[PDB]
């Protein structure tokens, strides 16, 4: 499921910590869960979209456009 980087069935700040690490390396174990805009990379867009979901302002993942 999208946003769940440790894979425990919740999307929370602990996945955001993993999202931060994923951006440094451009890779993580659950790549598809981390690539929120589906453009083949993990970068600041994904990090932002994850943060926006946690803030409650972005209602859906994955992201369109």
């Amino acid at each position: 499921v999208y946003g769940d980087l440790d894979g425990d069935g919740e999307v929370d700040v602990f996945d955001l910590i993993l999202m931060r690490k994923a951006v440094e390396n451009g890779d993580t174990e659950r790549f598809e869960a981390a690539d929120l805009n589906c453009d083949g990379v993990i970068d600041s867009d994904d990090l932002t979209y994850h943060s926006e979901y946690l803030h409650g302002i972005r209602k859906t993942l994955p992201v369109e456009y």
């Binding site: 946003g3 999307v11 602990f14 993993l18 690490k21 600041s44 943060s51 803030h55």
Partner: protein, 172 residues
């Protein structure tokens, strides 16, 4: 393990600004690498103008974490029209000495009491989970405030006890 979070009380006239301190107590010795909570309120009485980082979250993580420039360590989203503000602090740094590790002021809220607010009126300043789904399409909301850390990419999640604050307007 467990940690306490609380909001102070304030008094201010209609149209004046007020401050509320958000504090942590009984921070475990293992520390807090990530924390996420919402501040909820009645927007007909108060609105939040800013939220500033507190002493205990003012660590080296903000200036040394690589992704800090892409997404700030202390990350705030004020949603006055929705009646809440969301506060997230997180870091990818592994060194626990850069995490939140002491009791004290986590952040300071500055807000404004409505010009219309009549004498005696009140509004709770509640600390609770951001209203969002546990995962996308779950149909069930996030029910607890998040606070903890990761070790071996595995989340260690503390229980969080919340004490709410209050804003009241005097008489003249």
């Amino acid at each position: 393990e467990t940690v306490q979070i609380s909001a102070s009380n304030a008094e201010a006239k209609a149209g004046d600004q007020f401050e509320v301190k958000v504090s942590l107590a009984d921070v475990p010795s293992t520390g807090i690498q990530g924390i996420d909570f919402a501040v909820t309120y009645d927007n007909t009485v108060v609105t939040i103008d800013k939220i500033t980082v507190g002493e205990i979250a003012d660590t080296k993580a903000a200036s040394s974490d690589q992704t800090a420039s892409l997404l700030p360590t202390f990350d705030v989203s004020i949603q006055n029209s929705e009646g809440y503000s969301s506060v997230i602090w997180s870091t990818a740094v592994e060194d626990s000495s850069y995490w939140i590790s002491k009791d004290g002021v986590l952040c300071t809220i500055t807000g404004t009491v409505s010009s219309n607010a009549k004498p005696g009126a009140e509004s709770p300043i509640k600390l609770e989970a951001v209203k969002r789904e546990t995962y996308v399409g779950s149909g069930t909301d996030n029910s607890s405030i998040s606070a903890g850390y990761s070790a071996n990419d595995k989340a260690v999640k503390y229980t969080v006890k919340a004490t709410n604050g209050k804003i009241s307007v005097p008489s003249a």
